[PDB]
Every structure is written in C-alpha cells, then in structure tokens.
Write an enzyme that holds these catalytic residues in place. Structure first.
Site, PDB file in Angstrom:
ATOM      1  N   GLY A  15       9.489  42.441 -63.150  1.00 19.31           N
ATOM      2  CA  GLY A  15      10.452  41.934 -64.108  1.00 19.31           C
ATOM      3  C   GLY A  15      11.108  43.101 -64.825  1.00 19.31           C
ATOM      4  O   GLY A  15      10.852  44.266 -64.496  1.00 19.31           O
ATOM      5  N   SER A  16      11.948  42.792 -65.806  1.00 22.55           N
ATOM      6  CA  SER A  16      12.651  43.818 -66.572  1.00 22.55           C
ATOM      7  C   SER A  16      13.058  43.319 -67.951  1.00 22.55           C
ATOM      8  O   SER A  16      12.911  42.140 -68.274  1.00 22.55           O
ATOM      9  CB  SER A  16      13.883  44.295 -65.793  1.00 22.55           C
ATOM     10  OG  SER A  16      14.723  43.207 -65.455  1.00 22.55           O
ATOM     11  N   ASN A  18      15.084  44.950 -71.995  1.00 22.12           N
ATOM     12  CA  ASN A  18      15.796  45.971 -72.765  1.00 22.12           C
ATOM     13  C   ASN A  18      15.133  47.340 -72.605  1.00 22.12           C
ATOM     14  O   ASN A  18      15.808  48.336 -72.333  1.00 22.12           O
ATOM     15  CB  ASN A  18      15.815  45.564 -74.242  1.00 22.12           C
ATOM     16  CG  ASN A  18      16.386  46.639 -75.137  1.00 22.12           C
ATOM     17  OD1 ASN A  18      17.434  47.213 -74.845  1.00 22.12           O
ATOM     18  ND2 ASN A  18      15.697  46.918 -76.239  1.00 22.12           N
ATOM     19  N   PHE A  19      13.815  47.357 -72.808  1.00 24.79           N
ATOM     20  CA  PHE A  19      12.951  48.541 -72.622  1.00 24.79           C
ATOM     21  C   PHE A  19      13.095  49.231 -71.256  1.00 24.79           C
ATOM     22  O   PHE A  19      13.050  50.462 -71.167  1.00 24.79           O
ATOM     23  CB  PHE A  19      11.468  48.167 -72.863  1.00 24.79           C
ATOM     24  CG  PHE A  19      10.933  47.101 -71.929  1.00 24.79           C
ATOM     25  CD1 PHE A  19      10.375  47.446 -70.699  1.00 24.79           C
ATOM     26  CD2 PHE A  19      10.980  45.749 -72.283  1.00 24.79           C
ATOM     27  CE1 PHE A  19       9.892  46.469 -69.837  1.00 24.79           C
ATOM     28  CE2 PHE A  19      10.498  44.771 -71.424  1.00 24.79           C
ATOM     29  CZ  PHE A  19       9.950  45.131 -70.202  1.00 24.79           C
ATOM     30  N   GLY A  20      13.265  48.427 -70.208  1.00 22.60           N
ATOM     31  CA  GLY A  20      13.391  48.917 -68.839  1.00 22.60           C
ATOM     32  C   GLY A  20      12.783  47.931 -67.855  1.00 22.60           C
ATOM     33  O   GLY A  20      13.169  46.755 -67.833  1.00 22.60           O
ATOM     34  N   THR A  21      11.812  48.401 -67.068  1.00 20.27           N
ATOM     35  CA  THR A  21      11.203  47.601 -65.998  1.00 20.27           C
ATOM     36  C   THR A  21       9.673  47.554 -66.047  1.00 20.27           C
ATOM     37  O   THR A  21       9.032  48.387 -66.683  1.00 20.27           O
ATOM     38  CB  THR A  21      11.628  48.138 -64.609  1.00 20.27           C
ATOM     39  OG1 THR A  21      11.197  49.497 -64.460  1.00 20.27           O
ATOM     40  CG2 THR A  21      13.146  48.074 -64.444  1.00 20.27           C
ATOM     41  N   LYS A  38       4.783  49.690 -67.490  1.00 20.71           N
ATOM     42  CA  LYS A  38       5.996  49.521 -68.284  1.00 20.71           C
ATOM     43  C   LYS A  38       6.721  50.870 -68.272  1.00 20.71           C
ATOM     44  O   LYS A  38       6.255  51.832 -68.879  1.00 20.71           O
ATOM     45  CB  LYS A  38       5.614  49.083 -69.699  1.00 20.71           C
ATOM     46  CG  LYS A  38       6.742  48.539 -70.553  1.00 20.71           C
ATOM     47  CD  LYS A  38       6.169  47.895 -71.805  1.00 20.71           C
ATOM     48  CE  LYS A  38       7.246  47.267 -72.669  1.00 20.71           C
ATOM     49  NZ  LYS A  38       6.644  46.364 -73.688  1.00 20.71           N
ATOM     50  N   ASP A 125       4.116  37.696 -82.111  1.00 17.49           N
ATOM     51  CA  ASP A 125       4.933  37.267 -80.978  1.00 17.49           C
ATOM     52  C   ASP A 125       4.079  36.463 -79.982  1.00 17.49           C
ATOM     53  O   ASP A 125       4.211  36.597 -78.761  1.00 17.49           O
ATOM     54  CB  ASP A 125       5.569  38.497 -80.307  1.00 17.49           C
ATOM     55  CG  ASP A 125       6.758  38.147 -79.418  1.00 17.49           C
ATOM     56  OD1 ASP A 125       7.150  36.954 -79.371  1.00 17.49           O
ATOM     57  OD2 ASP A 125       7.291  39.084 -78.762  1.00 17.49           O
TER      58      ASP A 125
HETATM   59  C1  LIG Z   1       7.938  41.728 -69.180  1.00 22.79           C
HETATM   60  C2  LIG Z   1       7.234  41.239 -67.943  1.00 22.79           C
HETATM   61  C3  LIG Z   1       5.943  40.713 -68.020  1.00 22.79           C
HETATM   62  C4  LIG Z   1       5.299  40.266 -66.866  1.00 22.79           C
HETATM   63  C5  LIG Z   1       5.933  40.343 -65.620  1.00 22.79           C
HETATM   64  C6  LIG Z   1       5.240  39.862 -64.385  1.00 22.79           C
HETATM   65  N1  LIG Z   1       5.938  38.969 -63.627  1.00 22.79           N
HETATM   66  C7  LIG Z   1       5.370  38.486 -62.502  1.00 22.79           C
HETATM   67  C8  LIG Z   1       4.092  38.873 -62.094  1.00 22.79           C
HETATM   68  C9  LIG Z   1       3.369  39.785 -62.862  1.00 22.79           C
HETATM   69  C10 LIG Z   1       3.955  40.282 -64.035  1.00 22.79           C
HETATM   70  O1  LIG Z   1       3.361  41.199 -64.872  1.00 22.79           O
HETATM   71  C11 LIG Z   1       1.952  41.243 -64.985  1.00 22.79           C
HETATM   72  C12 LIG Z   1       1.530  42.149 -66.107  1.00 22.79           C
HETATM   73  C13 LIG Z   1       2.465  42.789 -66.935  1.00 22.79           C
HETATM   74  C14 LIG Z   1       2.015  43.606 -67.960  1.00 22.79           C
HETATM   75  C15 LIG Z   1       0.649  43.752 -68.147  1.00 22.79           C
HETATM   76  C16 LIG Z   1      -0.233  43.083 -67.304  1.00 22.79           C
HETATM   77  N2  LIG Z   1       0.189  42.295 -66.293  1.00 22.79           N
HETATM   78  C17 LIG Z   1       7.216  40.864 -65.553  1.00 22.79           C
HETATM   79  C18 LIG Z   1       7.868  41.311 -66.707  1.00 22.79           C
END
Ligand SMILES: Cc1ccc(-c2ncccc2OCc2ccccn2)cc1
EC number: 2.7.10.2
Length: 261
Positions: A15-16, A18-21, A38, A125
């Site tokens: 995902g993505s 404002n911060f980035g990806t 992140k 949040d």
């Molecule tokens: C902002 C955001 C948050 C979660 C995802 C995400 N999307 C689909 C499968 C998995 C995902 O993330 C797992 C995750 C993330 C951060 C710490 C721990 N696990 C994408 C963007």
C-alpha cells in the site's frame, strides 16, 4: 540500527500514503523473518522517529512489533509482518467470518489496549483500518504516528494535523483532550466497524453533523447479526461523559466473559 545488507525488499508495494510506501521484505537474523517496511522534509522524519520511539517501548502480543530502523536509499521503519493486512478491508471481502470470530479479534484488540492503558500511552487513531491481521484469529494494533506517551503527573494529552472526527470522543472535539478513555470511544466505533464487515461509520455525514447527532444523544444502530451484549458494549464505550465511561480493563473484562460464556 538495522544493516541494509540483511534486508531484501519485494518489488511491488502492499500500500501507500502521504508518507510514502509500505513494502514487504525479509530480514536475515540463520532464521529469516518476513517484515513490513515503511519507506519514506524534516516533518516526515520526526513523525517516523516518534512512531519508532513509541513502538520501541511497547512489548505485547497484540501490538505490532518494531524490528528496527534502516538508513539506506531512504529512511525505513521495519516491523513484524501482519500478512492479511487491514481489518476493515479484510472484512469488506470476507462475509463468511462468524460473529464468534469477530468477538475473538475485537477482544484481542481490547487486550492490546489494556496494555497500552497500563503503559500510560494514548493511541489517538484507533480504527479498524489500523488493526492488522496476522491470521484470521490473531489481530495486532498498528499505526502509532499520533500516539503519545503520557507524562507521569497527568491522565491526558492536550493537543495543539490529521483529524478523524468520526472516531473522536466529545472531549477531544470540544476541549482537545486525549486520554485512554478517548481511545475507548474509538474502540466503540472500531467494534461497530468490525460487526458491519468493514463499512464506514456515520456514512454520508460531515464531522459537524456527527458532533450534532452525538450531542442529541443519538448513536449508530446495531449492525446486522451483531449480538446484543456486544452492541450494549459499543453504547457503553460511547458514554458522553469521560468520567462515567469505562476504561479498557472493564471493556476487556466484558469482552473476555461474553466470549467464553
Ligand atoms: C498503510 C498500510 C498498511 C497496511 C498495508 C497492507 N496491505 C495489505 C497487506 C499487508 C499490509 O501491511 C501489513 C503490515 C503493515 C505494517 C506493519 C505490519 N504489517 C498497506 C498499507
């Protein structure tokens, strides 16, 4: 600080923002651990650092764990991987999930929040989009960007940014005061979201219209198939007066007892 040579990143983003990806990755530790990263203006720096500093101090099974920070081509915050992602989106695509399975998950969120409360941290949040699933029966709390470690002499944070009014308790909107009790109101909205299979709260309404609704003593209705004991807990979370509203100890206890009865 993490060693960039030990970190391998997958090509596409999960995902993505404002911060980035947010990219998937693997950090070599003989046993290789799957990680979420992140990847990123000193504003974004201070926010990623402050989130890192909150996560460092936290140690609980129902809160996403931070592995560490990695300076390389960009700034990176490496965390445990919650493979199934955001709770709301998961439910938006999986209606087969039983109400017993949802109670297990929200109770797990309440246990993580019980620990945050005892540790004197405020999330600020708490929403279904920030509860990430490890498995279908194991949830963790994420996104500590707005989180605050409370001082030893006070029971709340007085805010001077992002403003998700639909999860905010009246004392937050009126006086800008955030405490563990405010997170309990948010938790109430979070439960509503969980039992409505990831649908948005107060749909179609503006923030000011949500505030007016709540000031008239009006609350959201019971979602389809949602048990009565769980809906009565949502309304208890949405107690207007912060004094009478329960803490996470009483909320966690309520969820524990019903789940095993
Ligand atoms: C902002 C955001 C948050 C979660 C995802 C995400 N999307 C689909 C499968 C998995 C995902 O993330 C797992 C995750 C993330 C951060 C710490 C721990 N696990 C994408 C963007």
């Amino acid at each position: 600080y993490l060693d960039r040579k030990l970190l391998t990143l997958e090509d596409k983003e999960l995902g993505s923002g404002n911060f980035g990806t947010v990219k998937k990755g693997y950090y070599q530790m003989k046993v290789v651990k799957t990680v979420a990263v992140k990847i990123l203006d000193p504003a974004l720096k201070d926010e990623l650092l402050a989130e890192a500093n909150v996560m460092q101090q936290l140690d609980n099974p129902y809160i996403v764990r931070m592995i560490g920070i990695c300076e390389a081509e960009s700034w990176m915050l490496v965390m445990e991987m919650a493979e199934l992602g955001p709770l709301n989106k998961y439910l938006q695509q999986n209606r087969h999930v039983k109400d017993k399975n949802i109670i297990e998950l929200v109770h797990q969120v309440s246990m993580g929040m019980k620990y945050l409360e005892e540790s004197n941290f405020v999330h600020r949040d708490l929403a279904a989009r920030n509860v990430l699933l490890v498995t279908q029966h194991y949830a963790k709390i994420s996104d500590f960007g707005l989180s605050k470690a409370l001082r030893a002499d006070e029971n709340y944070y007085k805010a001077q940014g992002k403003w998700p009014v639909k999860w905010y308790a009246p004392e937050c909107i009126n006086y800008y005061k955030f405490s563990s009790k405010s997170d309990v109101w948010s938790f109430g909205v979070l439960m509503w979201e969980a039992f409505s299979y990831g649908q948005k709260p107060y749909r179609g309404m503006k923030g000011s219209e949500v505030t007016a609704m709540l000031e008239k003593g009006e609350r959201m209705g019971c979602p389809a198939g949602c048990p009565r004991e769980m809906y009565d807990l949502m309304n208890l979370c949405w107690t207007y007066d912060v004094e009478n509203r329960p803490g996470f100890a009483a909320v966690e206890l309520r969820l524990r007892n019903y789940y095993y009865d």
